[model samples]
Target: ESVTVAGIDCGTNSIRLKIARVDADGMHEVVPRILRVIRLGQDVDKTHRFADEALERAYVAAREFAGVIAEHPIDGLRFVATSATRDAENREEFEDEIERILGVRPEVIPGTEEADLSFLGATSVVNRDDLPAPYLVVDLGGGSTELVIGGDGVSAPTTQVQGAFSMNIGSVRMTERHLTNDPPTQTQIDEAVADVDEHIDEAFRTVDAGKARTIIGVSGTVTTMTALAMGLKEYDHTVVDGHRLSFEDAYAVDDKFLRMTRAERREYKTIHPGRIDVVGGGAVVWSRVLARVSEAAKADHGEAIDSFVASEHGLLDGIVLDYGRRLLAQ
Candidate 1:
């Protein structure tokens, strides 16, 4: 028997909904996914609250998602709110509205839990025999980045997560904090890099990111970077997923985006319009994460971490998988 389920991931800059069916064979998408750049955590870093405009945008997106959910015969649904909601003082207000709109209360999952789910989803499709064990999954979102180190044990349905840590540095947060210019000055970029490095250091304290035999990166920032690196005129999940992105090439891409003005960036067909201004910050975050993990790998294994596998599956997939399992149990 198969069960249909839906999962919603609400982040600082975007909200995504995924619907899929799970059976003995595996999980399969039942409908095309939806993503909207709501910027729900807009200005939340400094204010510690959801802004009215941000909340309105989020509500509008939620309404659309509700309509889509209504069209499907989903057996279970799980909505997760991260980063922005985790930090906001007025999160309950937003949660209540979402619950009313979707008829499912949003789970304000802790960073550790978020990291575990991300690890499961990112590594679910990877073959243990093909990729090395103890996979390190990096989920760089709008409001935070989660680093999870584990492999076969962690990827299983039950999920045996090893070491996990979530840092407060992300694309949207980094841009709002440091990037002030249309084309930010090198000094601004440097400051943002330093800030992300500081948080990456904190993540290392909790998780040995370098110990992983293979690194897997997830979320919009990584997918977008992968698209650009491939020189694709449009986004292609098939090409991006499971693709090995070399650190050297990623750094080159980062530099390419950082040098381009907003107008210049928008001209690129692969770049998401909502992400144009903040994608530069995202690239810097990705670059810093790679450098830090590589440093750790060198110190521990005497070899630099060179590349990471990109995954289309992430928190949304994880949530739906979990929900489907729960429905099966019932």
Candidate 2:
């Protein structure tokens, strides 16, 4: 018999619900996934707490997700809160409301666990031959970015985690911290870039980020950026997922986004409505990460990383798979 499971990931900018069936063979989708931009981390960075409005928005989304979960007979469920929740002073309140709505208490997981989950999810379907042995998976979320470097054994239950690090820098967090202007001044941009660079440096100190031959980027920031790089008329996951984006092309898209106003960015068909104001910040973060990893790879491996493969499956996938495995074992 197979077991159905639901995985919920609540981030600073968005909340996602995914339901799937898992068995001896593998996991399969049971229903369409849900992604909503709730901005739970709104102003949390500065205040060090979850604002009432933000909590309300997140609660509303959780209620909706609970309704979705009720529609299916799921054997296991995992709800995880990242970044904003982890740092918020009033995280207990947020957790209480989530528990009340979803029946399962939210796990305010540490950055390292988040990194491991992201690595497993992002690299699950990656061809070892095409992507090569060592894989570096980067999960660029709303409030933080996770860098995990490992090989094919990443999906195994007994897999040994090689190197993983989660940086406190992310699109929404950086935007609120530095980019305050409508179009943002060059000084503001420079400050944000410098901030992200510092965190990347910190991550590399713990993770051998350059040793990997393949770089897989996951989450909205990377997916939306990949769409723009491909010049899609509209958002298309089919075209974006597994698409290889060269460093030059990705940087060009970032530059174009940086030059555009919020209004202009919204006019673009590929940009998400909720991400218009903050996507520029996300682009800068992505570009800097690519450059840093490339430099590291060059210095360590005598060659620079030319491109990154985009993955749609990320933390949620990891959550569901792990939840299913545990349920089966029980």
Candidate 3:
């Protein structure tokens, strides 16, 4: 029988399930994946209430996830919820609903903890017996941006930043807030980029440039852009992993996007349905960040970003690794 471990990560924009088969080397082979964009954090930014429709959507996704989990050949499962549900006015209500529908308890962890797990997963995938040095891990989600800085070969202090981050500044929020037209006006893009810069400048000020040589981007926005750049018709984790996007290359892609109308972006097969509307927002944000990072790099040693990924493995890997270690130690 195959030993299975599952991770259910509920975010502001969607709910995802990652079921994997554990190998003797402690790696989890990709087994199955289910994702639904329910927009659970809808209206929470303005109203602070989890919209009724959002809650229902989340519940429905959880129910569907429950069915999928039941079909997997797994020994244990873990359900984790991130920023959206954690910051809501009635998080307990959502948690209870998930429990009632899925027969599983969901742990609503803090943004910092979420960042920690992401760091662990990011590092685990990159750290190898032959690597020269460690890298920085950046997971930009719909609700938060996590930064984990450590050695190329060893794990060390990981940092976390919360609120008004790359996650919140995602394509959806950006399009909703600033880009309301088909080919969004320059003024709209400028305003949105300025807004994101204010937040990111503050969040990234504490990070030192001397430590790491690589920036590993792991998330939907980065991956989607990467897939489009690679001309993939659909999301393929294998191709996304370890794909490098230099600062100049990333900017060029953003420029290509800025020239497109909403209709143009939607026509692309690689863009996720939910993100089609806001991809412009994400592209601009990435462009500016890349510019800033490149400038910083030139100031130091004249280097550029190595690569990024949709990250075939992330939080779930972190959780499973932690759990397996504890089990062995006991």
Candidate 4:
């Protein structure tokens, strides 16, 4: 009648874990999503290999996850390793460490599949009546960003992924690649903007990340920005999720983070302590993304795009739900 599973994700910036109970109707979170900012993909961009320290941090996080995963009678578990491990020349070492700690091999999924899973992750909330048709779901992670356009307002119960694409640019990658300064200089900021824009332009060429009426952003980068944009004194789980963060607010928050020192950023209660450094890079990615998509929706589809729906769920939820669905089928 029901299936329970755990989803563990090793992204470029952090490790997130989700345990859920699923039935025909829906999924019930066994434990609320837990995210720790280990920044597993510390400097894979420059080094092309997992740094010794990065590996140690990830393994430490995985051991912590193993403690939580042990508490549930989980029917299945999937350890997903994203961009960092995917690009690392010595991903094998990363794998050996994780396997040793968590007793499961982390799958360094390809970009296409990562895009699909991320789309599926946000599907749980995409069906809400208020959220318009054609969702442009953005999963902005530490190493890569996945964008997908799907859903239809008419059906009122759709989770169809029209098309999706993953880009190499991400918060951590951008931070290491360009936004390297404490408070990145104007030139560095300018270069970072150019980098993401080029990738977004090329991604649009492959998959139409346009004509989307509503945007749903999942992952820490978007959520943290949303919290800052909303001026949350502390990160409130109840408030951030499903909150529609406006473009104007997003722009201000982006600027605020980019302009502040890492010390200044650390004082914000909403931001994870581990996330202080890379959020500057994250701000650029989100703002450019929001602007580009808003323009596309207006020009191509006659839709006025103004804001995005920030959610606590995404690929991790998708991973849990998908695996639970498969287990139930058996």
Ten contiguous residues minimizing lDDT sum, candidate 4: 150-159
TM-score of each: 0.95, 0.96, 0.85, 0.96
Writing each residue's lDDT as its tens digit, candidate 1 over 1-330 gives 889999999998899999999876668988756889999988888899999999999999999999999997888789999999999999999899999999989999999989888887877778766787678889999989999987445455224567899999898999899987889889999999899988988889999877776888999899999889989999888899899988888999988987679999988888878888789779889999988888898898788889888889888787877778778778
How much lDDT does each candidate structure score?
0.87, 0.87, 0.67, 0.86
For residue 278, model 4's alpha carbon misses the true position, in angstroms, by 0.4
Relative to the unseen true structure, what is the C-alpha lDDT of residue 91 in candidate 4, on a scale of 0 to 100?
94
lDDT of 3 by residue, 85-138 (tens): 766888888878888877778898776677667777766766554233435566
Give the Å error, residue 11, model 4: 0.2
TM-score of predicted model 1? Answer: 0.95
| RMSD vs true structure, all candidates | 2.1, 2.0, 3.7, 1.6
Candidate 1, residue 199: CA error in Å? 0.9
Ten consecutive residues with minimal summed lDDT in candidate 2? 151-160
RMSD of 2: 2.0
Q: Distance from true position, residue 62, model 3, in Å? A: 0.8
Clashing pairs in 2: none
TM-score: the better of candidates 1 and 3: 1
Q: Which scores better on TM-score, 2 or 3?
A: 2
| Best-first order by lDDT | 2, 1, 4, 3
Error of 1 at 109 (Å): 0.6
Candidate 2, residues 1-330: lDDT per residue as tens digits? Answer: 779999999998899999999887768998756889999998888999999999998889999999988987878789999999998999998888899899989999999999999887886677766777578899998889999988445553223458999999888998889989878889999999999999998999999887878889999899999999888979988888898999999999988887678988888888878888788778889999999999999998898999999999899888888888778888
Error of 1 at 147 (Å): 0.3
Q: Which is the better candidate, 1 or 4, if ranked by TM-score?
A: 4
